[PDB]
Amino acid sequence: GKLQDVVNQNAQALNTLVKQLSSNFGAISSVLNDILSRLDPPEAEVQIDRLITGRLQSLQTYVTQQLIRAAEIRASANLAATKMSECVLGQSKRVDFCGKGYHLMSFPQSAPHGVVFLHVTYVPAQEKNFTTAPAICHDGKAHFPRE
Amino acid sequence: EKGIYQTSNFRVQPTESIVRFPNITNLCPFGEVFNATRFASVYAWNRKRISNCVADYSVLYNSASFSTFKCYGVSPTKLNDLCFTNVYADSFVIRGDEVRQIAPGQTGKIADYNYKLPDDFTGCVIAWNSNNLDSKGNYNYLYRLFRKSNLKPFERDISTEIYQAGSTPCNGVEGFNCYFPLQSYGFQPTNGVGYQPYRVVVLSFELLHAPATVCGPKKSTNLVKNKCVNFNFNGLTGTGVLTESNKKFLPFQQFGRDIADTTDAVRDPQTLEILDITPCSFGGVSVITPGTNTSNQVAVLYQDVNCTEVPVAIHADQLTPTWRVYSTGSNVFQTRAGCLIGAEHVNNSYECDIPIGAGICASYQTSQSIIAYTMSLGAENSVAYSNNSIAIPTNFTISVTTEILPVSMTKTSVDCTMYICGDSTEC
Amino acid sequence: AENSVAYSNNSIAIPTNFTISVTTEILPVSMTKTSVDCTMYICGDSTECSNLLLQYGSFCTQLNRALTGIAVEQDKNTQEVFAQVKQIYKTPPIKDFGGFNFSQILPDPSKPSKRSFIEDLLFNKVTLIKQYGDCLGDIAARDLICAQKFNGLTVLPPLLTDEMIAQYTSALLAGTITSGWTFGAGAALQIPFAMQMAYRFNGIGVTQNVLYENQKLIANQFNSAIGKIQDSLSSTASALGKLQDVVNQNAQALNTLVKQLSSNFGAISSVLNDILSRLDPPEAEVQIDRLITGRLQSLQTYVTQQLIRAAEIRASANLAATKMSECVLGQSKRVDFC
Amino acid sequence: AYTNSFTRGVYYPDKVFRSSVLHSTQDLFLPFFSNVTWFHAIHDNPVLPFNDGVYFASTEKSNIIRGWIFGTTLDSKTQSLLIVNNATNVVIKVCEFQFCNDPFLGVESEFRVYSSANNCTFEYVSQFKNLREFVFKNIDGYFKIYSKHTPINLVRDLPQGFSALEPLVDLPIGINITRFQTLLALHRSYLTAYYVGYLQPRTFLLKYNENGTITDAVDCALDPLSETKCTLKSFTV
Ligand SMILES: *[C@@H]1O[C@H](CO)[C@@H](O[C@@H]2O[C@H](CO)[C@@H](O)[C@H](O)[C@H]2NC(C)=O)[C@H](O)[C@H]1NC(C)=O
Ligand SMILES: *[C@@H]1O[C@H](CO)[C@@H](O[C@@H]2O[C@H](CO)[C@@H](O)[C@H](O)[C@H]2NC(C)=O)[C@H](O)[C@H]1NC(C)=O
Ligand SMILES: *[C@@H]1O[C@H](CO)[C@@H](O[C@@H]2O[C@H](CO)[C@@H](O)[C@H](O)[C@H]2NC(C)=O)[C@H](O)[C@H]1NC(C)=O
Ligand SMILES: *[C@@H]1O[C@H](CO)[C@@H](O[C@@H]2O[C@H](CO)[C@@H](O)[C@H](O)[C@H]2NC(C)=O)[C@H](O)[C@H]1NC(C)=O
Ligand SMILES: *[C@@H]1O[C@H](CO)[C@@H](O[C@@H]2O[C@H](CO)[C@@H](O)[C@H](O)[C@H]2NC(C)=O)[C@H](O)[C@H]1NC(C)=O
Ligand SMILES: *[C@@H]1O[C@H](CO)[C@@H](O)[C@H](O)[C@H]1NC(C)=O
Ligand SMILES: *[C@@H]1O[C@H](CO)[C@@H](O)[C@H](O)[C@H]1NC(C)=O
Ligand SMILES: *[C@@H]1O[C@H](CO)[C@@H](O)[C@H](O)[C@H]1NC(C)=O
Ligand SMILES: *[C@@H]1O[C@H](CO)[C@@H](O)[C@H](O)[C@H]1NC(C)=O
Ligand SMILES: *[C@@H]1O[C@H](CO)[C@@H](O)[C@H](O)[C@H]1NC(C)=O
Ligand SMILES: *[C@@H]1O[C@H](CO)[C@@H](O)[C@H](O)[C@H]1NC(C)=O
Ligand SMILES: *[C@@H]1O[C@H](CO)[C@@H](O)[C@H](O)[C@H]1NC(C)=O
Ligand SMILES: *[C@@H]1O[C@H](CO)[C@@H](O)[C@H](O)[C@H]1NC(C)=O
Ligand SMILES: *[C@@H]1O[C@H](CO)[C@@H](O)[C@H](O)[C@H]1NC(C)=O
């Protein structure tokens, strides 16, 4: 779904830009050639300037939204480059950076506009209760475990 | 698809339509203005005050016998709906070709030496020719030819000093290039148009800020409060609920404004009470649905509205009967996000499916129905802590999970000239 | 301060004591969720203005879709930081944690609330659905939320309540204090608290006998440092500046949007109904189109600034989620990260 | 002879009610801490220019100040305006007078002001512990007057606080004005205590309290601190 969202948002932005060409923005018609077929240049200029203003506004709105989306996908790609070098080319001690559990190794697969990581972890399973102590006294001396 | 959608907004329509004009019945002296026996010359224009009467402009502009009738900050159609402030009438006689110069921002020497309109002029200019009443050889209409400067707007200059036009003075004497500043119109019944006399009346007023005495022939109505009505207070149209107020207006004030430049307080013209004005009930509607692949059942959330004020907020019986499945009933439930209608409130807790807000979610469960519940955070658990026990694991599990990340997006370009202009060289 | 190191080729300095330190780090997670009804902002109730607004296309569909995207991202921001574990670990009944005293950060057992003492101090310092339905009487007509509401501007509530967020933080605390770092990797495994502290001392390169021999000094230093945090929050009034900044920026942007409704943008009046009372539709259209163009420009400026602010608070919430999982569910070796 | 104003000469600039806001206004005002000319009398009244508007104050206890003469040349070649206060009304008259050299009123009323009233176009009539303040304005054929009166306790000069002037009357007199002159009532009729300031185009920031009253203002071109206050739209920095 994260990869399908990127395809959907961009197809939707292009479809909105195409559909804004049927707005007249206060002119007599949205069709430039129908304005040119009915009017002479000194008062056809009044209609064509309205159409020009509306279409320039539509394009500038599209380009601003593209710059903000591009900044978000640049941060996602920086994170994926860090995960490639820290989980596929090494073993990582950062908690939850390369899966859930204790990280052993990771494998990359390619996807359309993206990357899938397969993380292999160690998860402890079947626990028992025990009695425990911090130290052990033998001959007036305290003994601590080495590991 | 399954989700929750903002779709439109609800808005209760007004119930009555009131009009509140001052109780007055006198008629305005427009016969004494238009049907005067002798008008004034243009360098000495006559200014008459009009006050405290009922004016019916439609008689004037419909039953015209007029040639020019131009209204400037106002339309002639609306003139019988407004009330007016500081109404004045100017009146003079000029030549036919010089009717052109009585307009905002215009040259000539009627407009420059005799009578100047301002640029922010509100009012009307009325003209009609008068050759039957202003003929023979008539030499009783003077105008000025030479001044030193240009006049200000609404400034009258009546003084005949000898215009010095050389370098040497002329002390009360007509002499070398020293002229008498007024020269008479040479009217005859034998001229062509452009030299025949015209009679001109200029009305001028302010609109909609101050208390008013002059207005139009429409009848007042009762004052209805605590309901949504369509009011009119001396020309100020609007919509809302009216309520008694504690604002003390000073006597030169009639309206009050907000920070959005919105009229929120008004003084009644007949009673002298101060009322406050507030719009009707409104809000957003959200529609909770499963997929249309699944059902055609919906629940509706009226956002931050109390549940007993909904059949006021949407109107009861101005909409279709298929909007009154979703206005009262038994599936009516009050959340902190507003009022929810059409869902059954259960007492369990689940993982969230369709979020509503402030802890409430919704799902399509069991036949089938739509339910609303408080969501659960997770399974309750407890640790067996003591000061000398430990738990050690005896086995393990090898786990494999996935993580998906976006890397790149689609590269696009636009050809600006083909988007904006197509293949038009003028564009 | 100017300083100098006494470097030599056969000299070393070794420390002979230590200090237990407790410090504070504050991070923004989410911002206020808003919506605009554009037809009520641009046109009010006027159906003439409303029919003229259809000539400009789908600009309001576009603006509403941008604000709905921001509003959904705020609830994702909060889930990502606080819902990391799915077991609600209950507070342990008898507090015997080797001399370490956690009573000011745990929720109080007599009161049925979920907030701790320090969370109470924090919620009484940021000066921020209830005045909606109100604003009929005229003493409630000088506050700013009714003038926002009457022009189509709305505030939406968060999906998780404050009580729910405090239940999440209570469960994360109970898990750490009874299990160390085991509950973040799997099931929770209980260990006594001084043994947990001894192996964390081992994690920074000190032997565990240093902790067992100085256990009471270490617990006293910790209890004093918690009390100092509590005093500096209980009497100092600028500590949460990063959280107050977000509230201030949002309220200022909404106030500017409300005040732009009193510009005429080159028309005869900024009041649409006063244009409609004085003119008939062919010359009223010229004035209403100027007003429409100006108000659309004001809305588009608001929506663009909101999207850039939403991106900044999204990066801050990503950093908060990483700090939760690497400093609360583990011990970290990155220098100055925790 | 001079004094200084400190704050005096602010008026309501429109007729709309407003409460609990700040508002920015550009109009013709008298600046703060200007020096104003002082005319006193112990035992003259010259012609003074008009200069886009005039602030006028006068304190009195025995009713010496009565009306003014406005006009451009004051010598029967152009029109002029006359305002005269009587025992129980006021007489406004636009008319081509020939004014005396030192006009006054006698002990009972002796109109020793003019000598030939001719071509008379407009005429109007309607109904130290006393201070009265006036603002006169002459824009595009009108004559606007703002007024306020208050009980003064002070010993020599104008007080320190804040009073805003309310509108009095608007008169369509249609003439050109350059100078003005004050009319007194002398104790003995011999044909032979007030302050004057001038208005400047300014920008002011005004505050309204809960009851719709102007209580405080900021003159935006006084000093850099108030320029900061006007840029920020607040009284607190
Ligand atoms: C109002 O009256 C003044 C006073 O005479 C006029 O100012 C004079 O204008 C003439 C223009 O030719 C100059 O030569 C004089 O020097 C001016 N005198 C003074 C004292 O300023 C002024 O022009 C008049 N205003 C209008 C609009 O006519
Ligand atoms: C370790 O010991 C504790 C304490 O005896 C066990 O916790 C109890 O578990 C039973 C389930 O069989 C519950 O009914 C009790 O309520 C628990 N007691 C407490 C105080 O929580 C725990 O199950 C033991 N662990 C293992 C793996 O056997
Ligand atoms: C540790 O867990 C594994 C489960 O992954 C146990 O292996 C299972 O043992 C049972 C009984 O011997 C078999 O029926 C299953 O088929 C085994 N699974 C697999 C994948 O081989 C293992 O026995 C456990 N070890 C201990 C000591 O408990
Ligand atoms: C290490 O530092 C601690 C301070 O944190 C010392 O403890 C203090 O010792 C003095 C004198 O014995 C007492 O007056 C203080 O009250 C102690 N403070 C606390 C918190 O107990 C400790 O003595 C130092 N140890 C060494 C070996 O230098
Ligand atoms: C843990 O710290 C708290 C500090 O808030 C201690 O609580 C106070 O203890 C004193 C006794 O010296 C009482 O007089 C106060 O009423 C307590 N305050 C509160 C808010 O309960 C608490 O006693 C400490 N825990 C232990 C075991 O000493
Ligand atoms: C003016 O007089 C004519 C007749 O001389 C009459 O027909 C007309 O109605 C009058 N108009 C007004 C406004 O009195
Ligand atoms: C006319 O207005 C006056 C103003 O107070 C009011 O007293 C009177 O009742 C009104 N007349 C009618 C018939 O309403
Ligand atoms: C509609 O729903 C049914 C049942 O889930 C599904 O089989 C069908 O494919 C859906 N329609 C489309 C167009 O996906
Ligand atoms: C809704 O109205 C009822 C009756 O006026 C009131 O008791 C209730 O408190 C209201 N709801 C809220 C959320 O205030
Ligand atoms: C849910 O529980 C409450 C008890 O507080 C009860 O009043 C209510 O009727 C229950 N709802 C249903 C549907 O049984
Ligand atoms: C106005 O009066 C002040 C009062 O001290 C004085 O400083 C200033 O010089 C005066 N103005 C002029 C132009 O002299
Ligand atoms: C002034 O007041 C007296 C007192 O009654 C009155 O007779 C007179 O008409 C008034 N006007 C003038 C111009 O004297
Ligand atoms: C003004 O008065 C004089 C004499 O008093 C007269 O001759 C003239 O016609 C009057 N009117 C003017 C100049 O408009
Ligand atoms: C505003 O008016 C109220 C009601 O008369 C009064 O109580 C209050 O004192 C007034 N405010 C001021 C500043 O005088």
Please characterize this protein's 3D structure.
Chain A contains 3 helices and 5 strands. Chain A has helices at 2-19, 32-38, 41-88; strands at residues 102-111, 114-124, 127-131, 136-137, 142-143. Chain A starts with a helix and ends with a strand. Chains in contact: A-B, A-C, B-C, B-D. At the B-C interface, strand 1, strand 12, strand 15, strand 17 and strand 25 of B face helix 3, strand 2, helix 6 and helix 11 of C. Strand 3 (127-131) of chain A pairs antiparallel with strand 26 of chain B. The PDB classes it as viral protein. Keywords: SARS-CoV-2 COVID19, viral protein. The entry is titled "Structure of SARS-CoV-2 spike at pH 4.5". Chains A, B, C, D: Spike glycoprotein.
